[PDB]
């Protein structure tokens, strides 16, 4: 059951690279693609993310996309740069200048076809294609504009395959341009319609974590990507490593998404790292449920959990996890919907991430995620009620009403989230 990975834009490609650095090290594959590990468990589910090639080498099933060559020259340059099949580097030259319209309608359309040609050639070589995953930001132009364009094109060719994304949200605390709320609102509406799971990675939270708790005075995009790569690995371990779970992308979607449009998860991780003291299991669980470990800058206690999933990595007492997980639920049982019985599910995998003997990844589907969309929505209107900076978009063909609709669709989404937050049995 193979997965096809796509990374688009600067952010999309640099978190994407760190992801492949991390898991490639976990499965024991070196920067050349040659496996040199200690366990057979490292390779049993290696076909999920790796094509096996001539001469015992493993090449990620990954497609690298950008509308300018800048950072993908840097990817090819980086630690694991030469791991990727070079045919899968697909890029234009003009760049998208942080413009959703350029990525989705003009500059991106010129190149989208070339990308899906590589998609098809990875799919055709797939025993049974399970689904796609994308890494990208929503505040730029390529990852946002083109990224959502490819997703729409992939749903057209593969209408019955799962499409999940890792999506970086823009926050003023970590801002490139002022038009980010425009690009993110236009993308969210695309994600509402054509993705099964979207992991909301808020750059605000990633900043707060890096500065408040990790106590790093001036966080870099690198320091924020360490948190993303560790979470992306933690999430993907249900499939990357053999539990006695029969984990399937579709199956996991079915068990966490009670309503089609409400598929935006809050990620989390513990322990938060940048030390040697072994961390108790009771400490792992109380951290992952604390908002300070949330990658989405929302308080879980102003909403209610629709579904939850917790992944524990390491050698630990599966009886102590069951004990303390069922303990936290009652410290917070007011914050779990009562009309979805047994909506907190736990998984364990023996192999831990490199550097820590014990880790936990938190995947929450909370109605408190609306706080994120409300935040983006206010920044959006603040400028749109004055048509500020619209000329950058209307010059590429868009009309104001496409903006009005996109705004309306997410104000709808926020309303849908609060329907189920007040709802009771």
């Amino acid at each position: 059951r193979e997965i096809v990975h796509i990374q688009a834009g600067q952010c999309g490609n640099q978190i994407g690279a760190k992801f492949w650095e991390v898991i490639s090290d976990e499965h024991g594959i070196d920067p050349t693609g040659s496996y040199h590990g200690d366990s057979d468990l490292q390779l049993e589910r290696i076909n999920v993310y790796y094509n096996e090639a001539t001469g015992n080498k493993y090449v990620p099933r990954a497609i690298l996309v950008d509308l300018e060559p800048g950072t993908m020259d840097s990817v090819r340059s980086g630690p694991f740069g030469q791991i990727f099949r070079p045919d899968n580097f697909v890029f234009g030259q003009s760049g998208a200048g942080n413009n959703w319209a350029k990525g989705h309608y003009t500059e991106g359309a010129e190149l989208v076809d070339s990308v899906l040609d590589v998609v098809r050639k990875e799919s055709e070589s797939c025993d049974c294609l399970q689904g796609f995953q994308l890494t990208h930001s929503l505040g730029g132009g390529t990852g946002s504009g083109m990224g959502t364009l490819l997703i729409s094109k992939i749903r057209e060719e593969y209408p019955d395959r799962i499409m999940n994304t890792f999506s970086v949200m823009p926050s003023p605390k970590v801002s490139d341009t002022v038009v980010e709320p425009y690009n993110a609102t236009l993308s969210v509406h695309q994600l509402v319609e054509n993705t099964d799971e979207t992991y909301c990675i808020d750059n605000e939270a990633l900043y707060d974590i890096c500065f408040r708790t990790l106590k790093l005075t001036t966080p870099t995009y690198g320091d924020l990507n360490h948190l993303v790569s560790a979470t992306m690995s933690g999430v993907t371990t249900c499939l990357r490593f053999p539990g006695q779970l029969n984990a399937d992308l579709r199956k996991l979607a079915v068990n966490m998404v009670p309503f089609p449009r409400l598929h935006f998860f809050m990620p989390g991780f513990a322990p938060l790292t940048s030390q040697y003291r072994a961390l108790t299991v009771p400490e792992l669980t109380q951290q992952m449920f604390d908002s300070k470990n949330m990658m989405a800058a929302c308080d879980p206690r102003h909403g209610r959990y629709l579904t939850v999933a917790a992944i524990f990595r390491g050698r630990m007492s599966m009886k102590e996890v069951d004990e303390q997980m069922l303990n936290v639920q009652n410290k917070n049982s007011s914050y779990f919907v009562e009309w979805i019985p047994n909506n907190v599910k736990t998984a364990v995998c023996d192999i831990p991430p490199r550097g820590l003997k014990m880790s936990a990844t938190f995947i929450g589907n909370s109605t408190a995620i609306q706080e994120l969309f409300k935040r983006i929505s206010e920044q959006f209107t603040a400028m749109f009620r004055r048509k500020a900076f619209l000329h950058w978009y209307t010059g590429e063909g868009m009309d104001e009403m496409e903006f009005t609709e996109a705004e309306s669709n997410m104000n709808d989404l926020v309303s849908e989230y609060q329907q189920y937050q007040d709802a009771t049995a």
């Binding site: 749903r155 057209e156 209408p159």
Partner: protein, 54 residues
């Protein structure tokens, strides 16, 4: 409390003890409803592919 119908053999025995006495659809209409849900699916996929064409 009666014992009755005691049958035995080399593998075992059996009996009954009483303590007190007392006081389908077709083939064609299945594979039609399998087909009635196949078209409900192709109609939903058409409305999507129509939506994407818009």
């Amino acid at each position: 409390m009666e014992v009755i119908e005691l049958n035995k053999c080399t593998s075992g025995q059996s009996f009954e003890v009483i303590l007190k006495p007392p006081s389908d659809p077709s083939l064609e209409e299945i594979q039609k409803k399998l087909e009635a849900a196949e078209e409900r699916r192709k109609y939903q996929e058409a409305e999507l592919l129509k939506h994407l064409a818009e």
